[PDB]
């Protein structure tokens, strides 16, 4: 069968949140047979468990948060695109603050500390989530959509009237997340991070790990790891934004003008619609449509 994965060994990380600007300590354990991604308020008394589902997003007006009472976890969306990315089902992680570090801005940091640590494959078949019909969500021009497809792809389109300038496309039949997604890091424009500033937000910012762009240009002096390193982010956040499904996905994945807000409305519409989806696993790894890389 295609098995469920956990960490083979603990991952300890730390780093600073985007927007608190606050040390963050990041511990990620392995964790039981379908027990999924649960993020874990470690600095709190007791400890607040959010599982990484859907139904606990609070916030996406910037990144995707997870709520429980008045306690968050803010900017799940790359670590979450990471665990994705390497097929890894079950694990705790804990965090000593409301926000997962930012690292360089993409899941690059991520893939690189759990590939060390290494996976374990568990005594039990993982569970797909098989789209089974078109699903599309539209607010305004932005449109979000799964459509079936025996295997997992995802294409964004992205529309900036700007000079730096975006559309792609990405397989994982021949597409590695690891080497041609993981790696694209989080953009922002001057004009918006000085309000965010004066917001007092984004008080993490910085060139280790973002984008930035002027009305013209890139502003980083050492450049781009893609001439498409925009639009490839916007699809390691869309396979974060899915991966609250809390299984891998068989399936296609388009975005036009997408963000996390209307992923999340994706997300909630396919759950409510059943005919849309069902729960597969495979008991043969030799005729799924889709393949890991060994633990
Ligand atoms: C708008 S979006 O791109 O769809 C959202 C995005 O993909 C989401 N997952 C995400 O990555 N993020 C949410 C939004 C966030 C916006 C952002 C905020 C701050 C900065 C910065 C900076 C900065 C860099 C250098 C200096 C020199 O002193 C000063 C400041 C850059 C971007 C970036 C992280
Ligand atoms: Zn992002």
């Given at each position: 069968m295609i098995k469920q994965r956990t960490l083979k060994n603990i991952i300890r990380a730390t780093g600073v949140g985007l927007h608190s600007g606050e040390k963050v300590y990041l511990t990620l354990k392995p964790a039981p047979v379908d027990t999924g991604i649960v993020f874990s308020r470690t600095d709190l008394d007791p400890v607040v468990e959010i599982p990484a589902?859907?139904?606990?997003?609070?916030?996406?007006?910037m990144s995707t948060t997870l709520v429980k009472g008045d306690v968050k976890v803010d900017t799940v969306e790359h670590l979450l695109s990471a665990m994705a990315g390497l097929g890894i089902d079950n694990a705790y992680v804990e965090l000593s603050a409301s926000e997962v570090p930012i690292m360089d801005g993409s899941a690059g940091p991520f893939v690189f500390l759990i590939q060390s640590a290494g996976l374990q494959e568990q005594e039990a078949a993982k569970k797909f989530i098989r789209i089974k019909r078109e699903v599309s969500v539209e607010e305004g021009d932005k449109r979000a959509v799964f459509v079936p497809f025996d295997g997992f792809k995802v294409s964004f389109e992205i529309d900036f009237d700007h000079p730096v300038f975006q559309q792609a496309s990405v397989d994982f039949s021949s597409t590695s997340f690891v080497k041609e997604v993981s790696r694209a890091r989080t953009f922002g424009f001057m004009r918006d991070i000085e309000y965010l500033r004066s917001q007092?937000?984004?008080?993490?910012?910085?060139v280790e790990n973002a984008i930035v762009v002027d009305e013209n240009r890139?502003?980083?002096?050492?450049?781009?790891?893609?001439?498409d390193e925009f639009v490839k982010h916007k699809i390691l956040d869309a396979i974060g934004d899915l991966y609250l499904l809390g299984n891998s996905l068989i399936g296609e994945f388009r975005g036009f003008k997408s963000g996390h807000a209307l992923n999340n409305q994706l997300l909630r519409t396919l759950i409510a619609d059943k005919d849309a989806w069902e729960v597969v696993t495979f008991e043969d790894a030799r005729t799924a449509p889709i393949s890991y890389m060994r633990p």
């Open positions: 589902r859907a139904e606990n997003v609070g916030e996406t007006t007092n937000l984004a008080l993490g910012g910085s890139v502003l980083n002096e050492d450049g781009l790891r893609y001439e």
